[PDB]
């Protein structure tokens, strides 16, 4: 039907407030929930309904700063929340040593991203510490882990690393040559990109791989025209009405962004069917509580609400800012980031 | 030991064995964002978990505490890491931990932390004897679980267990020929064993796929596999393929078949073939057939492909 803009604004507001205990499993990634909400409000041009200053302090309290003796550099970045019990400190005093306190790549990413959206200038971010932490996360095969203590490694984190380096406008955070190698090796026989070599290609990892290369400004250099044509074919074949993540799987609203954004980066999103995509996304809209779900008549969540809105944005929905397809923020925010990078270079 | 829902469950703040520890609370500061409300029970377990973590206490009581923390939130990677630290420090029976993680994964097969934990255990034990059967059970509840397939490929490659996988793949393709995960597995097995350079293997595979396509012509997975194993060798280098496909067009048609033909004609044009201008028209004719009636949703895309072929071969 129609886009219930105000309802979605309220939905995101509620996400930033208080959640029922049934959402406890999101504790360690509250920062990315904040991202979905903040970036979602930005996308709807409603960042005025929140107190940017309070939220900025909260985010800074999540930064893992180097200790006096700077012996924990390999563990700096941002935490997903305060679940460790470390005393509230909005990046004021130095770091309070803790045996298991370290950053998480997806949190360092969403954290920096949130700060930029809120208008902060990142002056309180220990850029060198974050980059040191990032470097420590890269494996021999070029991919990344989420935390220094060890975790699964895949394309998702390669994208996070790329975004971090891009936002801090410094690529010393990774061995780009090895990352590119990992991305190439993930290409499947069916031409999509998988989480890793040999795995089933997926809409999500294809976005992560392609967006990473675009952020590095090496798409053309890494893939030949023939290769890019094969990838484009794989991606555009994902549309059924809305988009699915892999062949023979049901469509899901969030792919309208994952795959749609990939198509945009490959310059052929314009050749997709807008109406069927838009109609599907809206059919998953929760007209009562707001937000979007993965499927129609399904429960809405911050992730699908945000990506459904970004999916709509790709087709320039009336009332939604244009999303920067590779950075995953509003073009307005990406622009503000350009200014920031400029001001630093002086 | 003491279950979280047992009638006789006692908060850690009321347990004698924990009297010496000062619980550590979480603090989100003056204005909390995305704050989750916790029940007394939940906050109590984690207030003590924080205490134990902060002091890096490698005790048996801490080990039992992680069991509760995990029951409350299996997505807390820090808890799993600490539990692994304890598994080592206390030299716990890893075979028992395998039973534990096996149950946890069955209840939460989509959790990243639980699959990572199991992988670390198998690496520690250097024992993959239970893996293939465990994964087959999970794949039995959800044949497309990405975590399961990823773990399966890791186990097979790490301990070289290729012997029966191709047979497993054949079994699953009979259960659901449309499972894209299984077709991916098939290519994974073959390219890591015999490879496809053996003409006898290539022929077996191409023939196998055509048989599957004949059974269910509208299956992107089968068509992607077929194109996948031939595209790099050069589609135009297989004359009998082109004709065999043109013979299916009558009945077993589908947008996947039409698309394949277009790709064959394109490969030909790419290799300065004979009747360049005539081949190009055969292609363009198909692109338009796709756009106007066979794959209309991609109408603008096929037209775009057509225009690309013209401006490149004329």
């Amino acid at each position: 039907l129609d886009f219930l803009r105000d309802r979605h604004v309220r939905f995101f507001q509620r996400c930033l407030q208080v959640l029922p205990e049934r959402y406890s499993s999101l504790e360690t990634s509250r920062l990315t929930i904040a991202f979905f909400a903040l970036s979602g409000l930005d996308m709807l041009d409603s960042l005025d309904v929140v107190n940017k200053d309070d939220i900025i302090e909260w985010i800074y309290s999540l930064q893992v700063l180097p200790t006096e003796d700077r012996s924990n550099l390999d563990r700096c970045g941002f935490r997903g929340s305060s679940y460790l019990g470390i005393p509230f400190n909005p990046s004021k005093n130095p770091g309070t040593a803790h045996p298991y306190d370290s950053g998480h790549i997806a949190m360092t990413y969403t954290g920096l991203s949130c700060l930029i959206i809120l208008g902060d200038d990142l002056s309180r971010v220990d850029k060198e510490a974050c980059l040191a932490g990032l470097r420590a996360l890269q494996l021999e095969d070029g991919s990344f882990c989420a935390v220094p203590e060890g975790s699964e490694n895949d394309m998702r984190f390669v994208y996070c690393a790329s975004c971090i380096c891009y936002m801090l406008n410094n690529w010393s955070g990774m061995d780009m040559k090895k990352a590119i190698s990992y991305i190439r090796r993930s290409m499947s026989y069916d031409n999509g990109l998988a989480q890793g070599a040999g795995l089933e290609s997926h809409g999500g990892s294809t976005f992560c791989g392609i967006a990473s290369l675009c952020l590095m400004g090496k798409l053309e250099e890494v893939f030949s025209e023939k290769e890019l044509n094969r990838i484009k074919r794989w991606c555009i074949m994902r549309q059924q009405n809305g988009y699915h993540g892999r062949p023979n799987k049901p469509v899901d609203t969030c792919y309208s962004f994952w795959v749609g954004a990939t198509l945009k980066l490959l310059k052929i999103f314009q050749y997709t069917n807008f109406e069927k995509n838009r109609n599907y996304i809206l059919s998953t809209q929760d007209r009562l509580v707001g937000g979007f779900a993965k499927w129609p008549d399904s429960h809405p969540d911050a992730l699908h609400a945000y990506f459904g809105i970004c999916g709509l944005s790709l087709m320039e929905e009336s009332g939604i800012c244009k999303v920067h397809p590779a950075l995953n923020v509003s073009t307005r925010t990406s622009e503000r980031l350009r200014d920031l990078h400029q001001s630093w270079k002086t | 030991f003491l279950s979280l829902d047992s009638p006789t469950y006692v908060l850690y703040r009321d347990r004698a064995e924990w009297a010496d520890i000062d619980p550590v609370p979480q603090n989100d500061g003056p204005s909390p964002v995305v704050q989750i409300i916790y029940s007394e029970k939940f906050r109590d377990v984690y207030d003590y978990f924080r205490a134990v973590l902060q002091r890096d206490e490698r005790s048996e009581r801490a080990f039992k505490l992680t069991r509760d923390a995990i029951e409350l939130n299996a997505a807390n990677y820090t808890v799993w890491h600490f539990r692994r630290v304890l598994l080592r420090s206390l030299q716990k029976d890893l075979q028992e931990e395998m039973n534990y993680i096996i149950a946890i994964i069955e209840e939460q097969p989509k959790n990243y932390q639980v699959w990572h934990h199991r992988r670390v255990l198998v690496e520690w034990l250097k024992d993959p004897s239970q893996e293939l059967e465990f994964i087959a059970d999970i794949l039995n509840q959800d044949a497309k679980n990405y975590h399961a397939w990823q773990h399966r490929q890791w186990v097979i490659q790490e301990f070289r267990l290729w012997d029966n996988e191709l047979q497993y793949v054949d079994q699953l393709l009979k259960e659901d020929v449309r499972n894209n995960s299984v077709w991916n597995q098939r290519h994974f097995v073959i390219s890591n064993t015999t490879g496809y350079s053996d003409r006898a293997v290539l022929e077996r595979e191409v023939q196998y796929t055509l048989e599957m396509i004949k059974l269910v012509p509208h299956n992107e997975s089968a068509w992607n596999y077929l194109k996948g194993i031939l595209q790099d060798r050069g589609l135009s280098r297989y004359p009998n393929l082109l004709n065999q496909l043109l013979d299916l067009q009558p009945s077993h048609s589908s947008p996947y078949l039409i698309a394949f033909l277009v790709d064959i004609y394109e490969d030909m044009l790419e290799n300065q073939c004979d009747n360049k201008e005539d081949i190009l028209n055969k292609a363009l004719e198909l692109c338009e057939i796709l756009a106007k009636e066979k794959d209309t949703i991609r109408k603008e895309y096929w037209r775009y492909i057509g225009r690309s072929l013209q401006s490149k071969h004329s």
Binding site: S25, S29, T32, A106, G204, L303 | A75, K110
Partner: peptide
Amino acid sequence: CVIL
């Protein structure tokens, strides 16, 4: 959480 589906993605983390």
